[PDB]
């Protein structure tokens, strides 16, 4: 058969997702790229980013536990 029939359930929602259901991450290791600041400044990139608003942006990875804050660093 090339025709397929479907069953729809539509009485009540089974679950409710967050408006931010589809979210993204940045690997924590990108913080070790020298040009981190430059990269995130990209207009091309920010336009894409707004395209998926609203969403969470998680900054983490294996490197999450191998990063340290330096108040002295410029």
């Amino acid at each position: 058969q090339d025709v397929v029939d479907l069953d729809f359930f539509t009485q009540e929602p089974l679950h409710l997702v967050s408006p931010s259901f589809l979210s993204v991450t940045i690997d924590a290791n990108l913080a070790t790229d020298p040009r981190f600041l430059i990269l995130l400044g990209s207009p091309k990139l920010r336009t894409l980013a707004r395209g998926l608003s609203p969403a969470y942006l998680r900054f983490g990875g294996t490197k999450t536990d191998f990063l340290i804050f330096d108040p002295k660093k410029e």
């Binding site: 931010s20 993204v24 940045i26 913080a31 070790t32 981190f36 600041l37 995130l40 400044g41 920010r46 980013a49 707004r50 998926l52 608003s53 609203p54 969403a55 969470y56 942006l57 998680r58 900054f59 983490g60 490197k63 191998f66 990063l67 340290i68 804050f69 330096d70 108040p71 660093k73 410029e74």
Partner: peptide, 23 residues
């Protein structure tokens, strides 16, 4: 490895200006 106040700023601005909630 280390990161700076500047890095944090960058990251935050990226999120805020792009309509995203940073975790």
């Amino acid at each position: 490895s280390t990161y700076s106040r500047s890095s944090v700023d960058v990251l935050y601005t990226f999120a805020n200006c792009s309509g995203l909630d940073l975790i």
